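The passage that follows is intended for readers who have already worked through the single-chain material. We present the inputs for a multi-component assembly, then the predicted structure in tokenized form, and finally a short commentary. You are encouraged to pause after the input and sketch how you expect the pieces to fit together before reading on.
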Amino acid sequence: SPIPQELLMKYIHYARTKIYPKLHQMDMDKVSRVYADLRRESISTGSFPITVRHLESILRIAESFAKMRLSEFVSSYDLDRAIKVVVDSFVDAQKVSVRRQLRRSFAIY
DNA sequence: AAGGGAAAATAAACAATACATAACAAAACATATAAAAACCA
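Having made your guess, compare it with the prediction:
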């Protein structure tokens, strides 16, 4: 069932030394819309804010998933996994009182 | 339906007051006898 270890460690060195997947401005602006919701909802219920470093982090996580997918560019649904990775790290790094944010992020989950 | 958040509860240190009784005072209740005072005689 899983990928063997030797092929995986050879794939790491093969993908990290040959490709450089960029991003195209066709429909990527939608993540700036969802960040605009996700920043604002962290002020009213949460105490810790979300900044531009999280946007740089999800673009890096999406291009890392595109690097692992070995594509020419980042797809539209790589950002969905990137925003899931940032929601279950930032929301999980807080109190139990940000519990409404567990369902507030359920619309984009 | 969730949740904020103020009311309510708990605890602990400290201060302030009440309480049980000790010690006593004083008034009611009680008797005694020598001196006055009526009082028969």
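Commentary: Helices of chain A lie at 5-16, 30-44, 52-69, 78-90, 100-104. The CA atoms of residues 58 and 83 of chain A lie 6 Å apart. How closely did your sketch match?
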